[PDB]
């Protein structure tokens, strides 16, 4: 029961962080025509990908905890359904950010190999 609570506490935290990191990526806007802003944008996004990587460990940890909870057989019908929906969401929201962050990294690095 404390498992099911420690899990759900980490889930809201990572999930919230995930909406925030989306927020951040979608505020960044467009890559600069100015090679000077671009380099800044590039070195900023590299700290973003460092941050991404660390939170990738948290997402997996919650995926492990969630799964094992299901696996114990010790969850009720509803409890299981919910842990199941939560991991869909965690999987899908993570992958959506992870892909856009990788695009951005590529577009940023490509536009600097060009211009800088």
Author numbering: 338 to 453
Paper text:
Utrophin (Utr), the 395 kD autosomal homologue of Dys is widely expressed in non muscle tissues (reviewed) but is restricted to the myotendinous and neuromuscular junctions of differentiated muscle and is located at the sarcolemma of developing fetal muscle. Dys and Utr potentially act as cellular biomechanical shock-absorbers limiting damage to the plasma membrane with the spectrin repeat domains acting as spring units by undergoing force-induced unfolding.
Comparing the structure of Dys-SR1 with Utr-SR1 results in rmsds of 0.8–1.9 Å (112 Cα) depending on which of the four molecules in the asymmetric unit of the two crystals are superimposed in a pair-wise manner. Dys-SR1A and Utr-SR1 (A & B) form the more typical conserved interaction between W354/W324 with helix B H392/H362 and helix C W431/W401. This disruption of sidechain interactions relaxes the Dys-SR1B main chain so that canonical helical main chain hydrogen bonds are formed in contrast to Dys-SR1 monomer A and Utr-SR1.
